[PDB]
Structures are given as structure tokens and as C-alpha cells.
Amino acid sequence: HMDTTFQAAIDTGKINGAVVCATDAQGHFVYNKATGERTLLSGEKQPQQLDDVLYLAAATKLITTIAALQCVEDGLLSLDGDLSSIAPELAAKYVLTGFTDDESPLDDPPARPITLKMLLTHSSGTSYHFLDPSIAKWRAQYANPENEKPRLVEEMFTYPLSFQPGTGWMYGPGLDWAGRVVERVTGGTLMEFMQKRIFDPLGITDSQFYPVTREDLRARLVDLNPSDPGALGSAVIGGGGEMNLRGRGAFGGHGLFLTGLDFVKILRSLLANDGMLLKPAAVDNMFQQHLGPEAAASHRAALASPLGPFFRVGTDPETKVGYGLGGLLTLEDVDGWYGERTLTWGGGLTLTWFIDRKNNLCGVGAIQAVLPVDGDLMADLKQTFRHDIYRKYSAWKGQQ
Numbered sequence: 237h238m239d240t241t242f243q244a245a246i247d248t249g250k251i252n253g254a255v256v257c258a259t260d261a262q263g264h265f266v267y268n269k270a271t272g273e274r275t276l277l278s279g280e281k282q283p284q285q286l287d288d289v290l291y292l293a294a295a296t297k298l299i300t301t302i303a304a305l306q307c308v309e310d311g312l313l314s315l316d317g318d319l320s321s322i323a324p325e326l327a328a329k330y331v332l333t334g335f336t337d338d339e340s341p342l343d344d345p346p347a348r349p350i351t352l353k354m355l356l357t358h359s360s361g362t363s364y365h366f367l368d369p370s371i372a373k374w375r376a377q378y379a380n381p382e383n384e385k386p387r388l389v390e391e392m393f394t395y396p397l398s399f400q401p402g403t404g405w406m407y408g409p410g411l412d413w414a415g416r417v418v419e420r421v422t423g424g425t426l427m428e429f430m431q432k433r434i435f436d437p438l439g440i441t442d443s444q445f446y447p448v449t450r451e452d453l454r455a456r457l458v459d460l461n462p463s464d465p466g467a468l469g470s471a472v473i474g475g476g477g478e479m480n481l482r483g484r485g486a487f488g489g490h491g492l493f494l495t496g497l498d499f500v501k502i503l504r505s506l507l508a509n510d511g512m513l514l515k516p517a518a519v520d521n522m523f524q525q526h527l528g529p530e531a532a533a534s535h536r537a538a539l540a541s542p543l544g545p546f547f548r549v550g551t552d553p554e555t556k557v558g559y560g561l562g563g564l565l566t567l568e569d570v571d572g573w574y575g576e577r578t579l580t581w582g583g584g585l586t587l588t589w590f591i592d593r594k595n596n597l598c599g600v601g602a603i604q605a606v607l608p609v610d611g612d613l614m615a616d617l618k619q620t621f622r623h624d625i626y627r628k629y630s631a632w633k634g635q636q
């Protein structure tokens with residue numbers, strides 16, 4: 237029902253198309269579909285194609301997670317080790333607990349060091365100012381940077397922690413920090429490490445972080461069009477591009493561009509656990525609850541908050557979930573849908589991916605929206621992909 241649902245959204249003019257890639261571990265059931273059209277900078281239209289270069293936005297976080305776990309394999313990092321020496325900027329942040337009645341900020345020194353595991357699971361305290369009202373308020377007052385000057389990760393995320401390290405959960409720049417850590421301990425750029433350790437082993441050559449300078453990639457960027465002549469990825473993240481525009485260096489949180497075909501190669505290596513990226517035991521460890529008890533309660537509060545629908549990635553409020561290394565982790569089966577310990581996340585408002593080891597399925601669905609982006613319709617279109625792909629999988633299994 238992707239087909240009739242996606243076409244109806246094209247006919248209303250609210251999307252231009254979609255890219256969907258899914259596969260079981262062995263490549264028996266494979267579904268790859270590009271739908272609709274893209275617009276070139278000239279105004280010329282072309283059919284959407286499976287090798288169009290997509291903005292991943294926060295689907296970058298999964299790839300940065302792998303890179304950081306590969307550094308763990310190398311012995312350059314550990315999951316629970318103290319990051320204060322590699323990332324002194326993180327050690328220096330205090331913990332904002334709230335405000336007075338005269339709106340004065342109450343903070344406290346951090347009770348413990350920040351660790352890689354905390355960065356990978358959004359339990360370090362580093363929170364996105366646009367999701368955290370307390371950090372939003374703090375930013376309004378003690379930050380008035382209206383200078384557009386490009387900033388490094390460490391110059392962009394200057395806010396205090398939202399909670400004591402390890403005790404809460406809030407979506408934030410934890411993977412931008414982790415990417416910076418990976419650069420500092422490897423002595424090269426995040427892209428250099430990923431190209432060597434993730435993209436090369438999978439035969440991936442059509443990848444770049446923002447800004448996409450490669451001419452061959454620019455010729456296939458869906459997001460290089462008259463509505464987005466900067467190729468900022470506006471349609472994916474609901475509008476803007478501010479953060480990409482303002483940035484300097486790779487952002488492990490959001491910055492990657494990649495085809496749908498190449499992204500599903502990454503998903504499928506983790507699904508098959510084929511040793512191409514990480515040793516099998518390190519992959520297994522990704523599909524576990526890595527929030528402690530207090531952090532897990534905070535996660536569930538966030539999931540019941542007004543932002544909860546974004547944080548749930550389409551899973552039902554009655555489904556028990558945690559946070560693994562790489563995304564949301566279901567903690568129970570949904571018959572006919574995600575098995576327990578399915579890992580899932582997404583990018584912006586338009587893209588979502590999942591890895592379901594129990595039922596042997598992974599996939600990415602990436603809507604190519606038209607500005608202004610209808611957020612409510614994007615949620616329906618993503619859900620349609622997430623459920624219809626299991627319908628298509630069952631139909632195929634039934635035909636054998």
C-alpha cells in the first residue's frame with residue numbers, strides 16, 4: 237500500500253517521491269523501489285532512482301555509532317571509560333536542574349564522567365536545545381550568538397547538561413560528540429575513518445558528509461533543486477538547513493549523504509552479523525537495553541511527552557522499549573510486525589530505518605517531501621512503509 241499511498245501523496249503535490257530498500261539477511265526477500273520524480277536545479281524532472289543520493293540526517297547516527305564501536309574494537313576507546321581527557325569540553329559542562337522564580341539558572345557540577353555508552357544512547361545529558369525547553373531557555377539568555385561563523389562540533393554544542401550523566405534520556409548531540417572523539421583518537425577526519433572502516437569493506441563509494449562537494453554526487457542529490465539550491469536537506473528536516481549551514485567539519489549526528497542502496501548494505505551487514513564491520517559479539521551487544529534504571533524511566537517519560545511520537549519511531553505506546561547502541565530497541569514482540577530487540581531510528585521527518593533480527597528483516601524508507609513539509613502526512617507515509625514492508629515480506633514467504 238506504499239504504491240497507492242505514495243502515489244496519492246504525489247498527486248496532492250505534498251511529495252515528489254520515495255526510495256525504499258529492504259532485505260532479509262541472505263538476500264532472498266529483497267524489495268527495492270524508487271517512486272516518483274526529482275527536480276534538477278534547471279527545473280528539469282527525472283524519475284526517482286535507487287541510486288539517487290539522499291540526505292540521511294539522523295540516520296547518520298547509526299553509522300557514527302558503528303565507527304565509534306570500531307574504535308572500541310581497536311582498543312582506542314571503551315564503552316564505559318572516562319572521556320574527560322579526550323573531550324574536556326564535555327567534562328567541563330555543569331548540570332542544569334531548573335530555574336528560580338526570578339528565572340535564575342540552577343546548575344550543579346557533574347557527578348561522574350561522561351562515557352561513550354552515554355553519548356551513543358542519549359543518556360549523557362547533552363540535549364538538543366530545540367527539544368529541551370530548559371536548555372532552550374538557557375540558550376535564549378546566556379547565548380546570543382547571531383554571528384553566522386562556521387562552528388566545529390565543540391563550538392556549536394556549548395550548552396550545559398540537562399541531567400546528571402547516566403541518569404536521564406534526551407535526544408541530542410551525543411553522536412556529534414562521539415564523532416569528534418573518533419577524530420581525536422584516530423588522528424584523522426570522521427569521513428576518512430568511515431571510508432576506510434565502513435564504506436570500503438561494503439564497496440560504498442557514493443557518500444559524503446555535508447557539504448557535498450563532489451560533482452558526481454551533486455548531479456544525483458535529490459535535495460539539490462530549486463527549493464533547496466544550497467542542498468541543505470531542508471525537505472528532510474522539515475525546513476531550514478541552519479545547522480548544516482553553520483557547521484564546520486563532519487557532524488556525526490546528522491551530516492551524511494548516501495544512496496538508499498548503500499544504506500541498506502550497512503543495515504544488512506548488521507542483520508546478517510557477517511563480520512564485515514564489527515565482530516559478532518559486538519553487534520549482539522548493540523541490540524541490548526543500555527539505559528540504566530533511572531535513564532530508562534526518563535526515556536519513557538520522554539516517550540509519553542508531546543515529543544513522544546517522534547521518539548517512538550512509529551512503535552505503539554503499549555510496546556515496551558529501551559535504547560540500544562544505535563537507536564530505539566523494542567523489548568517485546570509485535571506479532572506480524574517488529575520482533576523483540578528490533579533496532580530502529582530515522583532521519584528528520586521523512587526517513588526511517590529498522591533492523592529486525594528476530595524476524596530476519598531490515599529496511600530503510602526515505603520519503604522525498606515537497607516544501608513546506610506536511611509533518612502529519614510524513615508520519616503516515618513512514619508508518620505505511622514500516623507496516624507494508626512486513627505485508628510484502630509475509631506475502632513472499634507465503635508464496636514459497
Ligand SMILES: CC[C@H](C)C(=O)O[C@H]1C[C@@H](C)C=C2C=C[C@H](C)[C@H](CC[C@@H](O)C[C@@H](O)CC(=O)O)[C@H]21
Pocket residue numbers: 293294295366367407472473474475476477478479489490546547549581582583584585
Ligand atoms: C538535525 C537532524 C536531527 C538530529 C534528526 O534528523 O532527528 C530526527 C530523527 C527521528 C527518528 C527522531 C527525531 C526526534 C526529534 C526531531 C523531530 C528530529 C528531527 C529534527 C529536525 O526536524 C529539526 C532539526 O534539524 C533542528 C532544526 O532544523 O531547527 C527527529
